[PDB]
């Protein structure tokens, strides 16, 4: 009955405080993930005028699946848009980013990096 | 109340205090169809606002064209003299 | 002696005395107001030597409503000494008035009393006054 | 689960005079009577309560001191 809290609120609110030092210049474009109720995302971004530089998606449906931490979570953890982009800065609003969204941070650590 | 004012002039130098002893007041209508296109009134025909409206109602304007009911709303009473300065109207639409 | 209780600082600056009035240019708590026409410092002692007296004309009749309260407390040195070794201890309370301000307010009682009462009261204040009839 | 607070405590078995109605979570240790599957197949020694013997709540009982009394020959 009493005030229940929304959580997209504080998710983007924290993205704010976290978006004060890290920002993709396309010379090192950050890739930055909207966790969802069932799925996960990612996208490379350049941050000079806010246009959308590069793009993939987990949910893009070359294959769908379940198990939000799947090898589908690590195929979104591999995919790229081939260019001259190198080992990006993993934007993380989600705790233990070194392991939580490591599903994304794992597979791409070799080719995009 | 049939009280008539006219379009006075802007770009005023403050030399008007002295043309003010001879009676006048500013006045500016609000409302659409026109704008803050000010009108000038005199007092000793307002020595008889006593019977005109009370304070809440109608006044004619005869201000060239668009002579309709206009409401003098605000108060700009003045100290030390029992004079008055810038009483002003509005359109009813 | 309308004075306060709790004050942060006890030594202050003389208030500015120039220009017109700001607020309290009308009357509320009664039909009749006594306006002011020049500038001075009314000094709480006037007020209670011009209140008891107006009521001693009013013979505990109708009721009054004061529109001036002394805030800035003025100070003064005791015996004439040298110049300059500190500031004198606070010994008064002052209120500043400008032209165009209602100082007193009363209701109910007849206009003969109003005139023949505020004329009694103004004879104590250092400011020149003028009657006001709630002249809408 | 984030451990590091409460110790060891789970459900138990207890049968009453009536209806045997006390089987919720427990932290109660004692010596087993005889175990079941309608209830614990483990040390059954939550003992016995007032849980269903009689409430005062939705019930009745005996009254207070007395009335006038000088109406039945005193």
């Amino acid at each position: 009955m009493i005030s229940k809290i929304d959580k997209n609120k504080v998710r983007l609110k924290r993205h704010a405080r976290v978006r004060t030092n890290l920002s993709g210049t396309a010379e090192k474009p950050r890739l930055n993930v909207y966790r969802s109720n069932k799925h996960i995302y990612a996208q490379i971004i350049d941050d000079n005028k806010g246009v959308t530089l590069a793009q993939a998606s987990s949910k893009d449906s070359d294959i769908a699946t379940t198990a939000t931490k799947v090898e589908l979570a690590t195929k979104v953890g591999e995919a790229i848009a081939k260019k001259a982009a190198d080992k990006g800065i993993k934007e993380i609003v989600f705790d233990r980013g070194g392991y939580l969204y490591h599903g994304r941070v794992k597979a791409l650590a070799e080719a995009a990096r | 109340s049939l009280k008539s004012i006219i379009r006075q002039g802007k770009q005023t130098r403050s030399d008007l205090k002295q043309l003010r002893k001879s009676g006048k007041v500013p006045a500016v209508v609000y409302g659409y169809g026109t704008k803050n296109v000010s009108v000038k009134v005199d007092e000793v025909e307002f020595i008889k606002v006593i019977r005109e409206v009370g304070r809440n109602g109608v006044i004619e304007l005869g201000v060239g064209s668009k002579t309709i009911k206009v409401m003098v709303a605000d108060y700009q009473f003045d100290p030390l003299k029992n004079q008055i300065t810038h009483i002003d109207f509005l359109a009813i639409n | 002696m309308l004075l306060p209780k709790r004050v942060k600082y006890r030594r202050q600056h003389r208030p500015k005395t120039t220009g017109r009035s700001k607020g309290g240019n009308y009357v509320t708590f009664g039909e009749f107001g006594l306006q002011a026409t020049t500038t001075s410092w009314i000094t709480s002692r006037q007020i209670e030597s011009a209140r008891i007296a107006m009521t001693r004309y009013m013979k505990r009749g109708g009721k009054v409503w004061i529109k001036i309260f002394p805030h800035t407390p003025y100070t003064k040195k005791p015996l004439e000494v040298r110049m300059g070794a500190g500031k004198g201890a606070v010994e008064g309370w002052i209120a500043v008035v400008k032209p165009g301000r209602i100082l007193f307010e009363v209701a109910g009682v007849s206009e003969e009393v109003a005139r023949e009462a505020l004329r009694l009261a103004s004879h104590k204040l250092p400011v020149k006054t003028k009657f006001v009839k709630r002249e809408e | 689960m984030k451990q590091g607070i409460h110790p060891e405590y789970h459900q138990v078995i207890f049968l009453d005079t009536t209806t045997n109605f006390k089987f919720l979570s427990g932290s109660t240790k004692t010596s087993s009577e005889m175990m079941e599957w309608e209830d614990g197949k483990e040390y059954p020694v939550i003992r016995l309560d007032i849980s269903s013997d009689s409430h005062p709540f939705y019930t009745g009982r005996q009254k207070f001191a007395a009335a006038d009394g000088r109406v039945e020959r005193f």
Binding site: - | - | - | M1, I5, H6, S25, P56, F57
Partner: protein
């Protein structure tokens, strides 16, 4: 049992007691904040630490008075342990109906609260009574204050059969 007794009677009423739009505007039970207190600043407070190991699930935090007027204020003593029901213990020593093990002051009031935060005080030795008075027969203060799933007393009332008071 009790956690399901936060279901065994209530899912159908708490799906009907209101007639809201969807199932989820029609509430559940509001969470609890099992808190204890003391009336001594030293030893009763330093030695009223387990009765939570008895009733709550919290080992024992050390919060003190905040508002703390003239003689309330002290520091760091374990007078109020934050054993609020989160989800696991959110079926705590509260919905135990061991408030009948007194047979006094069951129906205390005509109502409960104008502030939705309800307070239900086992004042005396009403609660934790299945344990014999060994060391629990001394000074002991309670603080069962938590809100319920109803804006005022009104509909809170004539379906409150859970704790029946």
């Amino acid at each position: 049992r009790l956690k399901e007794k936060f279901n065994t009677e209530v899912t159908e009423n708490l799906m009907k007691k209101f007639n809201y739009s969807s199932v989820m505007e029609v509430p559940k039970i509001d969470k609890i904040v099992v808190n204890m207190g003391v009336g001594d600043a030293v030893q009763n407070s330093k030695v009223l630490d387990n009765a939570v190991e008895e009733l709550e699930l919290i080992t024992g935090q050390k919060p003190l008075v905040t508002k703390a007027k003239k003689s309330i204020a002290t520091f760091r003593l374990r007078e109020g342990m934050p054993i609020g029901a989160k989800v696991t213990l959110r079926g705590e020593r509260m919905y135990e109906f061991l408030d009948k093990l007194i047979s006094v002051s069951l129906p205390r009031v005509r109502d409960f609260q104008g502030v939705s935060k309800k307070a239900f005080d086992g004042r005396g030795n009403y609660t934790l009574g299945v344990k014999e008075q060994l060391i629990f027969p001394e000074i002991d203060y309670d603080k069962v204050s938590k809100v319920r799933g109803m804006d005022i007393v009104i509909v809170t009332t004539a379906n409150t059969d859970e704790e029946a008071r």
